[model samples]
Target: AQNPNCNIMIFHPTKEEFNDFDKYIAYMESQGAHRAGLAKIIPPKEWKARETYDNISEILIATPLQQVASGRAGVFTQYHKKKKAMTVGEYRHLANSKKYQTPPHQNFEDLERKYWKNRIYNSPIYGADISGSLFDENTKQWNLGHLGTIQDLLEKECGVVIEGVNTPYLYFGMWKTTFAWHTEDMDLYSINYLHLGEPKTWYVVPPEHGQRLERLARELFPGSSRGCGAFLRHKVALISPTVLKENGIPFNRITQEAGEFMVTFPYGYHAGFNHGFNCAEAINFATPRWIDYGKMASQCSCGEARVTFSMDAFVRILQPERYDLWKRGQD
Candidate 1:
């Protein structure tokens, strides 16, 4: 049950166990975090699903991301044209009444007979409105380490590039909404926490075949490349895990339920669909172990490919005192 290396891990730490920061890091280092993983954390204080659900009314402002008969407009505010889409006010009204099942008021297209549905990523909603992670809610108040989460520490120690990292992509999906095959930025660990709603179904490509999966995308899908151009601009190429299995690549399926947390390793290529209407938040972080590879990969947000981060300068800033701390067992 504990493959830990290249398989999806589902962890349910008790309330007391979940709050211990060092214990969590120890577990991650021991268990090969280079594969897709999942966890179901009991969140802090009163920040449960009820709190998140209620706050959406005032903070949920919408953008021009409307879905049309032809297709939905998306990919950053700058890339897509401004068109009339459901305002957050309108969406909140419909969702509050309809509850959670295939969100109403959007003309979701049928992709091979499955509903492509709606998604709201890191829009203006992060600081001003509804942020993605519970940890992020306090970020607006300037209380960064409120949760002692990995993200808080990464921002503190690993330079300020964490600002550009594309972690908290707060997604709202219904029915067959899907994400295409891809790995995390700079081959880093990705943590996905489903605050509420129906579970998400995930398929992950193991670490060994990471390159092969990328190659397969480039080979099978016309115009697909290693760059963001294909999946970003053009249609998201759908490559099934079944197809990967047929090609002799090892993969796994995970049906993540409500209150579950899913983690994808730096090299784990993953894709999934929502079974029903759901709200979730995801983010990525780098460990001390992840630094050299991160430097080599050189990826950052606004997130681009291994190009924007100034970590090399920051890495040098860590003196012999910090360097000597690594092996001291608490350093």
Candidate 2:
């Protein structure tokens, strides 16, 4: 229900239209859907809902609790000093048991009001290896792992599934739990599907404005960027929409309800928070267009981490495919 006048594109695909997701996505892209940075797809009303996460109830994970301040509800400024390593059963038990009826107090000292104090921001339940874990625990209809378009073309080239990039990851989100501003790895396109529970609020900056957002974030979190100019790659900064507007950056705000899919364009900088306890599955995919963007995506600022994906291998594998299409077109 937030961001009522948001200009984000919304697609209500009928049952027939939803039959070919790849074609629908290609059509959307041709119609300038990427310009919006992000778009939402609401499935047909009659699409049957099933148990997608029935097996996660007993999985154990480490969750770090973030104390949300009065105005800074979704920002994580300080590193968590404490963490709870417990099963999903224990975590969900605590989440449902804790009452969060009132708004949050700036200070965590007062617990009387129905205010939000802290939330459990756990790592993905299945982590990087979704194929080994809850691989089939999703709807066969709009499975993010195997989208029926050029988006999943990267998988055919890699020969091996690239964990979180090509494979899906399941997230457990609570009230005010956040995913900080960052682009998809290698500037690839990404899609997130809300399996169930509360809607999430998303903020996105268009592809052209991605650099502007990075500049503002570097200024706002200078300490984080001291060694790494691409510090946002760490995914730990959050600024409000009002701040963005004041700084002359165009942005879009959207509320993604349950049973919906949100697609983010290549090089789009996006961040968001959950309205409440929910589960979502997301993965990265690449269109033929993403190859060029992946080259421009920053590798490392300076003294940083090791390289994860091999762009050289990707190009080598696709050379024959590219040539075949090129020759066929000429013939």
Candidate 3:
């Protein structure tokens, strides 16, 4: 089949192939695997059914393999184990031990304050984690780190043409409730693999007609706390590999370990919701580019104030002089 605007790829390896735990680990290491987190052993007899759980055990297991095969950074869903939580102080201490320091603007105290404030207001129901850099509740932004590792892996293992010294940062959040549909400022394409507990329903609009749809969604789902404006109007598209016959909703179901479907952003508007109590994680990886907001003002026909908090601004501030670095690297 021709690759859809969004593609859902499923891969399942039987027990006979991964029978021995040692052999499995060796295979994963030989494939240049990086641990997103730990994996629980499920007997081969139960692999098929359990693999599709809402928690993303299989996807995490397959991500390294997929990265090696496809060259694109693999995105998957996984459960948040309490043991895996890291505190801001702990992360900083670890980074410091390795001689890794935060950028001047990203100091630990300021970030902690921001996270606490956001938790009190925006995400009070689900308190934010103070341990890691991935989720900055205060700015509501995700950071990408260690571009060198991603670049090396892709170039040496996958042999795919990759530009950008920094690989897009990858992150996942556990939402106690649903999140509003908002697009990232920089170019981003995401794939969400559902792991455990509850299934989420999504609505997507095609990129060409995104602006109109954004307006419609605003009218339909008012009081949405998500940021809005012209950029949000660009495109909206659903990304289900399997067509939904009921209501013809451009959505699909992900209950357990069933692979994932890609959502090419800056090309579509997408949003998701949980059925009830749900535990799901999504891995998002995207290389960002710098842009001058003042310069871009001339390009805005909508006369809307540029989103100060947009990812575009974040990229510009973080990599001020490297505006074309990614494109150059690609060339």
Candidate 4:
């Protein structure tokens, strides 16, 4: 970290004991999360198979995958969910039946050898309501544990929804639907909880080395001795660990499984691939530490704030006394 490299960590949490919902909220308010690593909460075997995803088939899937990668088996055909989308169960039925594949996609088995299905950013993914009996096409938020999350924490403290703040996003994947290297929006923190599914492998780059790696990429590619402006943001480049090591950058990897939570700190860069068929929920939040790196999260080192969108709200939560000065035009 002194040298500024990627520093993402995984947490193996065996049990999250709470007698009731109220107790759970109180615990979060008093608990402590590490400063540098993202938190990945994992469930042990007992709870691993506790919930059956068979009913999840009712959840509709999003297609023409908004931001997933495409490449496989020496044949990278144009993949844009021709049908636009379908329910996870329907797609699985066709995929499992070996009759519903796109060009390069063989059967469900083909994904293992060369993963090819992705259901990422599927917003309207059917989830908990008073009754699973009803759903809609424009829904995104899941009510399972809404009120105690960091998003809930922030909204409560600052009394605002903080524009651009992300609610939960649903993801369903075959194999190898890769999410390319990137950071969270507005440099915010993120938590990806695998609701039910196999596993997803993640490659993470620490926020510090994020800038470092991007600097060298632009310099070597653009023929400049140095760089700046957008600081050549990490999302703009896609380099692997080997290349990073060869050039003196740093990073790490992890195999995240079902029932596990992967927490990404503010400003950290990350990307991953889903292994088997699975569904997960992801959302964004801001922490106390995020205030220090807030601008960078919102804009990287780009000499710009992607969204000063919430600084006022943020200041109101963290240091209202200081906010009063800014309110007086002293900012």
RMSD of each: 9.4, 8.6, 17.1, 8.9
Per-residue lDDT of model 4, residues 246-283, tens digit only:
77766677777776767776666676556556666676
Per-residue lDDT of 123-166 in model 2, one digit per residue for the tens? 22211112322335455566675664332466654444432234
**Which residue pairs in model 4 clash with each other?**
6-206, 115-175, 186-297, 187-297
TM-score of each: 0.62, 0.73, 0.35, 0.60
Q: What is residue 244's positional error in candidate 4, in angstroms?
A: 2.0
Q: How do the residues 208-245 of candidate 3 rate in per-residue lDDT, one tens digit apiece?
A: 34555455445433433143334332222222222223
Backbone clashes in model 2, listed as residue pairs: 102-114, 103-115
Q: lDDT of each model, Cα atoms only?
A: 0.48, 0.62, 0.31, 0.49
RMSD of 2: 8.6
Quick one: best lDDT, which candidate?
Answer: 2
Order of candidates by TM-score, top first? 2, 1, 4, 3
Residue range 1-331, candidate 1, lDDT tens digits: 2455565554545555555544664585476544443333334443333344555534343443322222232221112233344544454344344433444433222322233223433111111113444444533221212334344455666654333323345665555456656665455666676766666777777765666666666666533354443242232445555467667666777677676667676566777666555667676665666555444441222123222233332333333233232223212
Q: How accurate is candidate 1 locally (lDDT)?
A: 0.48
Q: Which stretches of candidate 1 lie over 4 Å from their true place?
A: 1-5, 36-52, 64-89, 92-167, 226-235, 298-331
